[PDB]
Amino acid sequence: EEEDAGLVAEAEAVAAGWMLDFLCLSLCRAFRDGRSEDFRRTRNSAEAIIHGLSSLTACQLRTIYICQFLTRIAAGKTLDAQFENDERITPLESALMIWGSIEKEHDKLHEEIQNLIKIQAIAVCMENGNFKEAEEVFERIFGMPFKSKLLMIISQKDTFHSFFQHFSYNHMMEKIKSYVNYVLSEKSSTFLMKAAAKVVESKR
Amino acid sequence: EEEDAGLVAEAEAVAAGWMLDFLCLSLCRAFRDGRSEDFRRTRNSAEAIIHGLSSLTACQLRTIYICQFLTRIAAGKTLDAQFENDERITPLESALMIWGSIEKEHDKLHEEIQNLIKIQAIAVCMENGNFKEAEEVFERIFGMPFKSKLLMIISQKDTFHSFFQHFSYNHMMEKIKSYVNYVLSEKSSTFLMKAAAKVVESKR
Ligand SMILES: CN(C)C(=O)COc1cccc(F)c1
Ligand SMILES: CN(C)C(=O)COc1cccc(F)c1
Numbered sequence: 001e002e003e004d005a006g007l008v009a010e011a012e013a014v015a016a017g018w019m020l021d022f023l024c025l026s027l028c029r030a031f032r033d034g035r036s037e038d039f040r041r042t043r044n045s046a047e048a049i050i051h052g053l054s055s056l057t058a059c060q061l062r063t064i065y066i067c068q069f070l071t072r073i074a075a076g077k078t079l080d081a082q083f084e085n086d087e088r089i090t091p092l093e094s095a096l097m098i099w100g101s102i103e104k105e106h107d108k109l110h111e112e113i114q115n116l117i118k119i120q121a122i123a124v125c126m127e128n129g130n131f132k133e134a135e136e137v138f139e140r141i142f143g144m145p146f147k148s149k150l151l152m153i154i155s156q157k158d159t160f161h162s163f164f165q166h167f168s169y170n171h172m173m174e175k176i177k178s179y180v181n182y183v184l185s186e187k188s189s190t191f192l193m194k195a196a197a198k199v200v201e202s203k204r
Numbered sequence: 205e206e207e208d209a210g211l212v213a214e215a216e217a218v219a220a221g222w223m224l225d226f227l228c229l230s231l232c233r234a235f236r237d238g239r240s241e242d243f244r245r246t247r248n249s250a251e252a253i254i255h256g257l258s259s260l261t262a263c264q265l266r267t268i269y270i271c272q273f274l275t276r277i278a279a280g281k282t283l284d285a286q287f288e289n290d291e292r293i294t295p296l297e298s299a300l301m302i303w304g305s306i307e308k309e310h311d312k313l314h315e316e317i318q319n320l321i322k323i324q325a326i327a328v329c330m331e332n333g334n335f336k337e338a339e340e341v342f343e344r345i346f347g348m349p350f351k352s353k354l355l356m357i358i359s360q361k362d363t364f365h366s367f368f369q370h371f372s373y374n375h376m377m378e379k380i381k382s383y384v385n386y387v388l389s390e391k392s393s394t395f396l397m398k399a400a401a402k403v404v405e406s407k408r
């Protein structure tokens with residue numbers, strides 16, 4: 001009885017791992033495609049499946065961080081959303097923290113996404129008229145020429161600035177979508193998606 | 205692009221179907237074993253996966269009803285839980301409604317579980333001192349000798365009665381566990397559990 005129970009629990013852990021990779025792939029595709037409601041529903045499923053996983057491999061931790069990063073980016077303009085125990089941390093700041101924790105290459109794209117998130121973390125506060133919060137986010141992030149231009153913009157209390165039109169929220173989203181395309185390619189061959197794709201192809 | 209999108213959506217539907225069967229099996233096992241926290245976490249995952257499924261086969265509807273039935277039975281003593289749009293319906297009444305909707309054989313076990321749920325739907329109200337609610341549940345359920353004994357018990361306003369000790373909440377749970385054992389046997393061979401069990405066995 002106990003031997004059977006143990007084998008069943010190990011099989012549930014294997015299946016949970018396969019579901020996590022499949023849900024990450026689906027969440028990435030919904031983000032890339034701009035399918036907002038599919039992203040919301042897939043995120044709910046990913047969160048629930050994660051709470052049923054205990055021990056994680058390095059690969060599983062990376063997959064969970066990708067899901068959490070895209071969720072924060074999707075909520076980047078939702079300044080009322082609290083992703084950290086410290087209630088002061090804004091969604092784009094929480095995304096920046098995960099971006100710097102992921103075991104991944106720090107290539108030119110990595111640094112461009114990092115810097116776009118830093119700029120937009122301040123811009124979203126400015127656009128809402130949250131000038132004091134924009135200064136507080138600046139202090140937490142920055143923690144020379146890039147930094148000084150941002151402080152000057154914050155000090156001018158201007159809800160819109162041409163610098164934010166050049167390094168825009170849309171530009172940040174497009175660069176992140178380029179990275180998501182790489183994750184989609186990498187995870188397309190995981191077990192559950194491969195098996196489901198083989199079934200759909202067999203019926204055509 | 206649209207052809208690829210369509211094939212991807214069909215593969216996601218196949219994978220969702222496999223996840224639903226696996227989560228039903230896991231929910232059944234946690235119920236049978238009395239693993240309350242595993243049941244709670246698995247139920248959260250099942251609910252989320254169900255919201256991402258649109259069209260359902262008759263087999264998938266039956267699987268969803270089994271999950272919903274066990275969730276109501278697990279909440280049978282939680283009189284503050286509202287499972288229906290009509291806020292008056294108690295959890296055991298909602299379980300009885302699903303039990304009568306499932307496409308399944310109406311064998312002797314089916315009728316014994318049905319009658320135990322009817323008795324306990326009144327008993328749980330009585331045990332809480334909700335005498336008027338017990339009479340209202342009685343009217344909705346009943347909807348001759350079994351019925352008349354129940355009305356007599358309700359009219360006596362006795363928080364405990366020997367009739368409820370004979371056809372007890374524990375007796376109802378044990379009969380339902382006998383049925384769950386049949387569902388476990390039937391669903392053990394579904395795709396995801398079979399594949400995960402093969403992986404665990406291969407490593408032994
Ligand atoms: C701090 N919290 C509650 C979160 O990170 C919720 O977001 C998540 C969590 C996991 C997967 C996912 F796709 C999204
Ligand atoms: C009326 N509501 C919200 C429900 O029935 C929730 O319960 C559920 C639903 C689906 C699967 C499950 F395992 C449990």
Ligand SMILES: [Ca+2]
Pocket residue numbers: 079080081
């Ligand atoms: Ca806020």
Ligand SMILES: [Ca+2]
Pocket residue numbers: 283284285
């Ligand atoms: Ca109530």
